[PDB]
Design a protein around this ligand. Structure first.
Ligand SMILES: CCCCCCCCCCCCCCCCCC(=O)OC[C@H](COP(=O)([O-])OCC(O)COP(=O)([O-])OC[C@@H](COC(=O)CCCCCCCCCCCCCCCCC)OC(=O)CCCCCCCCCCCCCCCCC)OC(=O)CCCCCCCCCCCCCCCCC
Ligand SMILES: CCCCCCCCCCCCCCCCCC(=O)OC[C@H](COP(=O)([O-])OCC(O)COP(=O)([O-])OC[C@@H](COC(=O)CCCCCCCCCCCCCCCCC)OC(=O)CCCCCCCCCCCCCCCCC)OC(=O)CCCCCCCCCCCCCCCCC
Ligand SMILES: CCCCCCCCCCCCCCCCCC(=O)OC[C@H](COP(=O)([O-])OC[C@H](O)COP(=O)([O-])OC[C@H](COC(=O)CCCCCCCCCCCCCCCCC)OC(=O)CCCCCCCCCCCCCCCCC)OC(=O)CCCCCCCCCCCCCCCCC
Ligand SMILES: CCCCCCCCCCCCCCCCCC(=O)OC[C@H](COP(=O)([O-])OCC[N+](C)(C)C)OC(=O)CCCCCCCCCCCCCCCCC
Ligand SMILES: CCCCCCCCCCCCCCCCCC(=O)OC[C@H](COP(=O)([O-])OCC[N+](C)(C)C)OC(=O)CCCCCCCCCCCCCCCCC
Ligand SMILES: CCCCCCCCCCCCCCCCCC(=O)OC[C@H](COP(=O)(O)OCCN)OC(=O)CCCCCCCCCCCCCCCCC
Ligand SMILES: CCCCCCCCCCCCCCCCCC(=O)OC[C@H](COP(=O)(O)OCCN)OC(=O)CCCCCCCCCCCCCCCCC
Ligand SMILES: CCCCCCCCCCCCCCCCCC(=O)OC[C@H](COP(=O)(O)OCCN)OC(=O)CCCCCCCCCCCCCCCCC
Ligand SMILES: Nc1ncnc2c1ncn2[C@@H]1O[C@H](COP(=O)(O)O)[C@@H](O)[C@H]1O
Lengths: 347, 100, 19, 459, 50, 49, 120, 320
């Protein structure tokens, strides 16, 4: 791709998310989602193979279905309220349709069925954009309509996302599908606390984006898409094994790491509202995510899988890849728990 | 056949190249200084001065005081005809009871 | 005597299409 | 406690900036200096605990555990420098940094005034232990054993997180000093039943409880020597420390919730001891003996009498020293024969007489010989469980037969009889090994002269 | 200094000890104010403990 | 020389070093200026001078 | 939760009443921890490009420390401001609704009867 | 780096520096075809940069001090031991061939990097399009296994697709008899052990597979051994070639910018050379890999990134 065209298209992706974030009219919300999808399709088709065309087709169909259900929810809001302010919806049918549309745009279960395919079909950088930047706009719309979101619907979506994103990654060897099922489970964690305290939703979103961006940046810096090629990293760059070790232990929510920070706070906001069974079963189901993280740490850092002979040539070259913010994101995804009361800046 | 692998190395004997080895290191000066550090800062410092410290603790959890204080109280109330210990720990005048 | 490190049979268990 | 936290943290630049021949000696020296300073925790009072700050305090329960924790790091460095002599220098420094980080988590585990900081350090102790087992263990099964050690602990402890935050919302605080004075009676209900289970099962896994103990004869066997020392000497005692802190909040429901678990321990210490009669793996024999000894600490906490808590903390300190010495002795044979099979190398008193004297003293303290603090804790738990029910002495006394029987059979198989003919690499005992045995055993025998410092908050 | 590394742990002790004493002055709310130990200040004395 | 090819990080990028130290010094002096202005504004608003 | 409080003056990082609050000291332990995070970021940046970890790029390490201290100072100001707003709204709501917050009679333990449960 | 997206934005187009002389010419032939002078002769008639044929130590020549490393650090394979025992148990045959394919891939990356950064054409000797002709000639002689052929085809399928073919392929028609005559006149005691069926398989995969598939994507010039002695005839034939085939026609600034970004990142060039296919001829176990890697770190000038080595005299490291 032409770099000027790449910059204009990425600024258009950002502009779509911004127009979702800053606008007060539902038509501009729908316009921002349309602009975001329309600009992110070439980022997914960056390399021009049949897998990226399949992934972009599946992404287009699911996001287009979600955009049409979003506009039907908007139009029903116009029926029952005569106005267009981006606030609570004035009909439970419009609330259900908009919650379904945003659960499709986030790829929460049982609308998760596009996330592990599309992430596998696209490169690692566009997978990073899909799993970090494409969450910000629908979570903003969910942030603004939470007076009207049905409790049972969003909690069913949350627990179904956590359980399906737990069991999905247990069978995987591809790193992009592992990050995608990790995405599904984390979106379940983010929407389980949305109606109780949306500040912890914003906390979980920020800590998730930091940890996901760390893992995709490590996968790009080592050019690794499978488990078995990530297992050659100790013979190529032994620092990256320590980095994926601490970041995968952090994404599992093991204390004293930063990814223990959201889910603990989530439990801390779900027991104040007298829900005990629900954060308990959520935290027990998070052990599945921890299990396939531990599988990756056994394959990469804590053991040494056998390498090949041609690795000796790759010893004679240093990584010239721009590892943008990788030490910063590594620190901010592991050593951040003593700064846990910083979350009040998100209030 | 199987892959390109280093063969199993032998287990080393620290007494062959150094018959005065203390087991710490294969460099003999490093080995003897490791021995002296372990024996001085472990036995001469922590064990001897630590047992001296534990032996001379200033009335650890004030048991001795509690003997001597008890030796006050009995001596106060052997004389006054008071019983040596009341069965009520707290004064019954300052206890309200739930009536029935 | 030395530490067990994973062989080819251990490594190929992580190299299928599914685990 | 910041006079102990900052030197433990300064052990990190002490071990990463040392010369390559110096990284064991400097860490051993300064960890011994920290362990010498650890005796200033003995400023304990008959009425009040030693309350340092809003975050840190220490009563007479945490103080022997802290002195044992700060004492075990030099002994782990001595134990683990021979088999990691051929190791890469940076991985050797990472090993020492994992042990330093584990000690750093432990000393503010035992001094956490607030219970969720106790939980955070208590679960932070997983990560260095897991990394040590799964990275510097010897055999293949260390990965599976690390999985069992991780997912029994977390499956027990993530209910404990919800339970502690529930106490945080209900009482307003998880300060142990506040909860000494604001504790409410916990009435009989199903809500309080699963409250009790969520408070207790994480520590039941950590002790281990019989039936939940399956992580231990893998995680204590598939680990290196420093990992086995810290697991059997300190990390089994996080469960007893946590129970002695958390059964304050669980009254009066514990007085009938304890009845199954007491059975699981009173029968469990019969079974696991009996398992030690028929173990082929010496390291597994020491592991099942650890389960057998910690069953008494479970019973003594669950009957919650003063004599039981005194005997339970005495038995925890004594078992820490004894089981750490037994693992070090099993490693002293394993560095020579390269197999943990107990029937392999026999008659070792014919070849290693002073080391056989160390085996003899460790096995006599294992079988609770008076007046060792092993016997003091054993005997006080027996007294308190006799006051609990006069029949339990049978299950005590039969245990005190079998505890003798595996302690001497281990002595008879390894050290006595005719030696194995085909084994000819039995070197004389290095000065490091006998130094390690004496630094295990001489504190353990000196504590018989003054046992009141290891008898806990209600001496 | 030829042995600058052998002061990392003792100075880290003393500084830590220092901070412990520095924390005590922040917990001096009830100094000479408890019902057990309150008393009149002796001459040439401004606080009971430091 | 030692290397057969000139390394890109052989000689320091003096423009980048100058920008680094200039930005760092500017951030420190702006931080100390911000902190002194904030303690002055706090003492002004609470009448504690 | 406090979405209506910070909506009349939107997108203000530090409002004017935040200047009524005492700023974090430059010797704040939280700020020194964020400086330590910057130092660790400098060390990881030397490690991933295979530089000498403590020696190479002292200008770069110092800009890491400087940037984290600089960002974290404002983050701590906003943190202290939001907990101050939290307590201020709490206390004004307790003062504005005395029918919901009664002053409870603290009984002494001579009147308070608790059931005794014997350990035997 | 030096070149990136910003330099492409700020005006550095590669069709500006792409003259008529900017031709990538690969000279091919059997083991003693004598083409190596001819290649150099073309590079001294057209002003092209000559690249010699990559042996084991090509990557050693490009990196560090440019001197060859010991054989345990680079290659782990000997050409002379393949000449001695081709059916050897240690798997040296395909290990040597896979290391040679990686070395030729690094050489082809350097060739395209020079051609796209300077606009000077590059003469190569037996590029990656003509490496398989040895592999098949080993496999037809039973020197490797079919699993080695499948591994090579995997690595080739994911590596050679990323690049453009040469402009000109120069092949030298030499019979097996003249090859063995020049081997016996060469004097190498190991190279005289090459069988005649091996050379015949080399020439058969040359004339049967390589040139029939390269005549479509570039221009073949097939000389005999006596008319390859006259360089000026070959260069006069090159200067009157009407380039009408191959994907060098449809190369705008964008595609060649992407190719130049590829060939300047060497670990992405060498990415899929080490695909985790566990073949016993190339799989190095963990203890040997750890030992050889920790020894490679202790080589002089090899512990750090290149401008960060005190022991070879790098200055101002605290400001880099
Ligand atoms: C506010 C939020 C800020 C978020 C981060 C902003 C930067 C990242 C986004 C853009 C980007 O990628 O820039 C590259 C990015 C560095 O990322 P990188 O490529 O991984 O850097 C590796 C090496 O720098 C590669 O070395 P090099 O030789 O190529 O160049 C050396 C370079 C040279 O530097 C320069 O040239 C600087 C001068 C140019 C700046 C403009 C001058 C005009 O030195 C540095 O940049 C030193 C590192 C500085 C720290 C980077 C991270 C900043 C802090 C991030 C937020 C931390 C929050 C903690 C909160 C914790 C508690 C919750 O930033 C810079 O280069 C400049 C950083 C300036 C920080 C100023 C902070 C206050 C601003 C007001
Ligand atoms: C500090 C922490 C972060 C350090 C990152 C960089 C470490 C590094 O590169 O060390 C190498 C360097 C020595 O090596 P070198 O020769 O320079 O270069 C590397 C070699 O080539 C090494 O040879 P190699 O690379 O060829 O191969 C050996 C291989 C060996 O590796 C392997 O074989 C693979 C892995 C082996 C098994 C795994 C071991 C455990 C690793 C993970 C740790 C997990 C536990 C952490 C906590 C639990 C939660 C996860 O890799 C390495 O050794 C790579 C170097 C990294 C080793 C240390 C890693 C530290 C970062 C991770 C832990 C800290 C951050 C996360 C914390 C999480 C939450 C607390 O060590 C140091 O320089 C250590 C620091 C010493 C000075 C400390 C001074 C502190 C001063 C503080 C006050 C001043 C600042 C004030 C600020 C405030 C102002 C207001
Ligand atoms: C505060 C200051 C305190 C000062 C006094 C010290 C207090 C006790 C500390 C420990 C004393 C024993 C240490 C040596 C044993 C370990 C090494 C060994 O085997 O050496 C053999 C070796 C002589 O043998 P060898 O011919 O050269 O070679 C050995 C053979 O190859 C093969 O050897 P073997 O099999 O022929 O000979 C081993 C033999 C084997 O004999 C046995 O295993 C039978 C022992 C059990 C039955 C008899 C004792 C029953 C309990 C009654 C005694 C205690 C209460 C008495 C009071 C009245 C009743 C209440 O054991 C003995 O000969 C040792 C006799 C004493 C045994 C103590 C009980 C151990 C049993 C398990 C625990 C039971 C509760 C312990 C309560 C401790 C109370 C303090 O001895 C030495 O070289 C001695 C080295 C220096 C020892 C220093 C001890 C103190 C260290 C503390 C330093 C810091 C504080 C400063 C004080 C320093 C004072 C000098
Ligand atoms: C503590 C928890 C962690 C455990 C591991 C810690 C390891 C690190 C090391 C820390 C420092 C050491 C800690 C333990 C110290 C214990 C020692 C100690 O302080 O003792 C105090 C006890 C104190 O006893 P005491 O209470 O009567 O002392 C009176 C108090 N003063 C002194 C102030 C008046 O010391 C003694 O008893 C010393 C008596 C003299 C020496 C011993 C004489 C008899 C020895 C046996 C003679 C033979 C008898 C027959 C047997 C024949 C052979 C079988
Ligand atoms: C080692 C592995 C097994 C670990 C076992 C851990 C303990 C076993 C029981 C755990 C139950 C879940 C945590 C309970 C927390 C109680 C906190 C509380 O407020 O309780 C009172 C509350 C009462 O509600 P409330 O207090 O909000 O109500 C107000 C008060 N009243 C009752 C008067 C109206 O209890 C509950 O809300 C439910 C408690 C039971 C929850 C059952 C769901 C979990 C199912 C079992 C999971 C077992 C472990 C899973 C892992 C197994 C291995 C993979
Ligand atoms: C309340 C919250 C409101 C919102 C707050 C802000 C949220 C920010 C979320 C940021 C999400 C960033 C997504 C990734 C960056 C976008 C562009 C991109 O993907 O760049 C990658 C780029 C592509 O280069 P290319 O050549 O295509 O790579 C393939 C190699 N052949 O280059 C590469 O591939 C090089 C490899 C490194 C790229 C990593 C870039 C990471 C940048 C983001 C850091 C994390 C976010 C900031 C911190 C948290 C903030 C909340
Ligand atoms: C397996 C590995 C080894 C073992 C490891 C540990 C695992 C087990 C941990 C939990 C043990 C069981 C729970 C604790 C037992 C406490 C006593 C008890 O429940 O007694 C049986 C009960 C008698 O009735 P009662 O107690 O009065 O119930 C009314 C409560 N207000 O009877 C009843 O009420 C009838 C039955 C009710 C169903 C209870 C189900 C929940 C508890 C089990 C899970
Ligand atoms: C890195 C931090 C850089 C901060 C720069 C300033 C950003 C800013 O002014 O953001 C405004 C926002 C407060 O605006 P407000 O309307 O209260 O937002 C409600 C969100 N639901 O303020 C904030 O969101 C401040 C917190 C930003 C934290 C970003 C990193 C985590
Ligand atoms: N399979 C192979 N057998 C023999 N030589 C090979 C093989 N692959 C590459 N070569 C190289 O081709 C050269 C023959 O051409 P020349 O450079 O004229 O000697 C050898 O010396 C090797 O460097």
């Amino acid at each position: 791709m032409n770099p000027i065209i790449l910059i204009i298209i990425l600024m258009t992706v950002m502009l779509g998310t911004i127009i979702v974030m800053i606008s007060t009219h539902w038509l501009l919300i729908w316009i921002g989602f349309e602009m975001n999808m329309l600009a992110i399709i070439p980022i997914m088709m960056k390399k021009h193979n049949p897998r990226a065309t399949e992934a972009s087709t599946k992404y287009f169909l699911t996001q287009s279905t979600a955009s049409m259900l979003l506009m039907m929810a908007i139009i029903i809001n116009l029926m029952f309220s005569g106005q267009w302010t981006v606030m609570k919806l004035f009909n439970p049918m419009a609330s259900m349709l908009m919650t379904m549309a945003l659960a499709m745009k986030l790829g929460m279960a049982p609308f998760h069925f596009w996330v592990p395919e599309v992430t596998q079909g696209i490169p690692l950088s566009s997978g990073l954009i899909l799993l970090t930047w494409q969450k910000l706009a629908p979570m903003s719309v969910l942030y603004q309509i939470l007076p009207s979101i049905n409790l049972d619907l969003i909690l069913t979506l949350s627990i179904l996302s956590i359980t399906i994103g737990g069991w999905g990654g247990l069978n995987q060897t591809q790193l992009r599908k592992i990050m995608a099922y990790s995405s599904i489970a984390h979106m379940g964690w983010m929407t389980a606390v949305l109606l109780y305290n949306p500040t912890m939703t914003l906390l979980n979103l920020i800590i998730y984006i930091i940890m996901t961006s760390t893992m995709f940046t490590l996968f790009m810096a080592n050019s690794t898409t499978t488990t078995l090629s990530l297992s050659h990293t100790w013979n190529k760059a032994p620092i990256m094994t320590i980095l994926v070790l601490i970041t995968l232990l952090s994404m599992g929510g093991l204390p004293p790491l930063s990814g223990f920070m959201p889910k603990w706070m989530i439990i801390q906001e779900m027991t104040k509202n007298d829900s005990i069974i629900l954060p308990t079963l959520m935290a027990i189901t998070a052990l599945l995510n921890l299990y396939f993280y531990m599988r990756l740490t056994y394959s990469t850092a804590l053991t040494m899988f056998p390498s090949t002979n041609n690795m000796k040539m790759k010893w004679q070259f240093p990584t010239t890849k721009r590892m943008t913010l990788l030490p910063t994101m590594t620190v901010l995804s592991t050593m951040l728990l003593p700064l846990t009361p910083i979350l009040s800046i998100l209030e | 056949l199987r892959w390109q692998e280093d063969p199993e190395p032998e287990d080393e004997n620290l007494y062959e190249k150094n018959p005065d080895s203390h087991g710490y290191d294969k460099d003999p000066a490093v080995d003897v200084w490791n021995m002296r550090v372990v024996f001085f800062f472990g036995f001469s410092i922590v064990l001897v001065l630590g047992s001296t410290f534990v032996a001379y603790l200033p009335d650890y959890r004030m048991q001795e005081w509690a003997r001597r204080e008890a030796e006050r109280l009995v001596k106060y109330r052997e004389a006054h005809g008071l019983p040596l210990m009341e069965s009520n720990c707290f004064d019954p005048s300052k206890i309200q009871l739930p009536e029935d | 005597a030395r530490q067990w490190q994973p062989d080819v049979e251990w490594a190929e268990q992580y190299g299928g299409a599914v685990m | 406690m910041l006079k102990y936290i900052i030197p433990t943290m300064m052990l990190m630049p002490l071990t990463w900036l040392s010369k390559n021949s110096m990284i064991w000696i400097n860490t051993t020296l300064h960890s011994l200096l920290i362990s010498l300073t650890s005796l200033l925790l003995l400023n304990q009072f008959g009425d009040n605990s030693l309350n340092f700050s809003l975050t840190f305090f220490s009563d007479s329960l945490s103080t022997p555990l802290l002195i044992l924790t700060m004492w075990l790091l030099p002994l782990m460095l001595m134990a683990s420098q021979h088999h990691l002599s051929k190791e890469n220098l940076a991985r050797k420094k990472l090993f020492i940094s994992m042990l330093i980080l584990l000690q750093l988590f432990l000393i503010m585990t035992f001094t956490a005034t607030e219970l969720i900081f106790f939980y955070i350090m208590f679960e932070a102790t997983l990560v260095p232990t897991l990394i040590i087992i799964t990275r510097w263990g010897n055999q293949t099964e260390r990965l599976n054993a690390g999985l069992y050690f991780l997912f029994y602990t977390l499956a027990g402890s993530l209910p404990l997180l919800v339970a502690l935050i529930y106490i945080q919302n209900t009482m307003g605080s998880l300060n142990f000093l506040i909860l000494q004075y604001w504790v409410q009676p916990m009435p009989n209900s199903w809500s309080n039943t699963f409250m009790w289970l969520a408070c207790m099962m994480a520590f039941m896994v950590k002790m281990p409880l019989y039936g939940l103990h399956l992580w231990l004869p893998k995680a204590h066997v598939e680990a290196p020597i420093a990992g086995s020392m810290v697991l059997a000497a300190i990390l089994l005692k996080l469960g007893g420390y946590g129970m002695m802190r958390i059964t304050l909040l669980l009254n009066p429901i514990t007085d009938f919730m304890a009845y199954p678990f007491i059975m699981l321990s009173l029968w469990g210490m019969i079974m696991t001891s009996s398992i030690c009669l028929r173990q082929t793996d010496l390291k597994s024999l020491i592991a099942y003996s650890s389960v057998s000894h910690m069953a008494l600490v479970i019973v003594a906490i669950l009957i919650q009498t003063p004599w039981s808590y005194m005997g339970a903390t005495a038995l925890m300190i004594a078992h820490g020293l004894t089981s750490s010495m037994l693992f070090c002795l099993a490693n002293s044979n394993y560095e020579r024969v390269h197999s943990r099979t107990m029937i392999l190398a026999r008659g070792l008193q014919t070849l290693l007489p002073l080391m056989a004297a160390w085996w003899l003293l460790a096995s006599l303290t294992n079988l609770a010989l008076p007046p060792s603090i092993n016997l003091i804790g054993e005997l006080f738990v027996v007294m308190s469980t006799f006051s609990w029910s006069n029949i339990t002495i049978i299950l005590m006394g039969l245990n005190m037969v079998i505890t003798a029987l595996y302690s001497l059979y281990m002595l008879i198989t390894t050290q006595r009889g005719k030696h194995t003919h085909h084994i000819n690499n039995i070197l004389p005992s290095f000065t490091r090994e006998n130094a390690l045995m004496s630094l295990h055993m001489l504190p353990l025998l000196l504590l018989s002269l003054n046992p009141k410092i290891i008898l806990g908050p209600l001496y | 200094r030829d042995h600058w590394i052998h002061v990392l742990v003792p100075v880290g002790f003393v500084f830590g000890y220092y901070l412990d004493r520095k924390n005590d002055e922040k917990l001096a709310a009830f100094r000479n104010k408890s019902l057990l130990y309150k008393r009149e200040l002796k001459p040439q004395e401004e606080v009971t403990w430091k | 020389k030692f290397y057969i090819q000139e390394p890109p990080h052989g000689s320091p990028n003096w423009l980048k070093v100058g920008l680094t130290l200039g930005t760092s010094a500017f951030l420190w002096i702006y931080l100390i200026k911000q902190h002194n202005e904030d303690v002055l504004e706090y003492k002004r608003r609470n009448g504690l001078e | 939760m406090m979405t209506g409080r910070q909506a009349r003056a939107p997108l203000q990082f530090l409002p004017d009443e935040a200047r009524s609050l005492p700023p974090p000291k430059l010797t704040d332990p939280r700020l020194a921890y964020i400086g330590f995070l910057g130092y660790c970021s400098g060390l990881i940046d030397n490690a991933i490009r295979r530089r000498p970890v403590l020696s190479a790029g002292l200008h770069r390490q110092f800009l890491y420390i400087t940037s984290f201290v600089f960002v974290g100072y404002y983050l701590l100001k906003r943190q202290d401001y939001m907990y101050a707003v939290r307590d201020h709204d709490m206390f004004s709501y307790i003062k504005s609704h005395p029918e919901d917050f009664p002053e409870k009679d603290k009984k002494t333990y001579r009147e308070v009867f608790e059931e005794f449960h014997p350990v035997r | 780096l030096q070149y990136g997206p910003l330099a492409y934005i700020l005006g550095e187009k590669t069709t500006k520096k792409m003259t008529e002389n900017s031709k990538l010419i690969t000279v091919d032939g059997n083991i003693c075809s004598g083409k190596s002078k001819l290649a150099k002769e073309v590079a001294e008639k057209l002003g092209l940069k000559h690249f010699p044929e990559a042996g084991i130590h090509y990557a050693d020549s490009t990196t560090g001090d440019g001197k060859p490393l010991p054989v345990r650090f680079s290659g782990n394979c000997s050409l002379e031991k393949f000449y001695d025992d081709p059916k050897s148990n240690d798997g040296n045959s395909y290990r040597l061939q896979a290391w040679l394919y990686a070395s030729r891939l690094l050489q082809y990356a350097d060739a395209l990097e020079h051609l796209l950064s300077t606009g000077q054409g590059v003469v190569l000797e037996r590029s990656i399009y003509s490496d398989f002709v040895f592999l098949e000639a080993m496999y037809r002689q039973g020197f490797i296994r079919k699993q080695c052929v499948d591994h090579y085809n995997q690595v080739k399928k994911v590596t050679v697709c990323e690049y453009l073919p040469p402009h000109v392929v120069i092949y030298v028609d030499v019979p097996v008899s003249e090859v063995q005559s020049r081997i016996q006149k060469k004097g190498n005691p190991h190279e005289m052990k090459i069988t005649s069926a091996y050379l015949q398989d080399i020439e058969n995969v040359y004339k049967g597979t390589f040139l029939p598939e390269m005549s479509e994507k570039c221009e073949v010039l097939q000389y005999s051994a006596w008319e390859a002695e006259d360089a000026e005839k070959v260069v006069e034939d090159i200067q009157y070639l009407k380039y009408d085939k191959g994907p060098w026609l449809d190369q705008d600034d964008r595609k060649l910018h992407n190719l130049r970004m590829l060939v300047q990142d060497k670990l992405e060039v060498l990415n899929y050379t080490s695909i985790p296919v566990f073949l016993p001829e190339v799989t190095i176990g963990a203890h040997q890999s750890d030992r050889v890697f920790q020894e490679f770190t202790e080589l002089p000038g090899r512990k750090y990134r290149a401008g960060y080595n005190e022991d070879v005299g790098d200055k101002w490291i605290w400001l880099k």
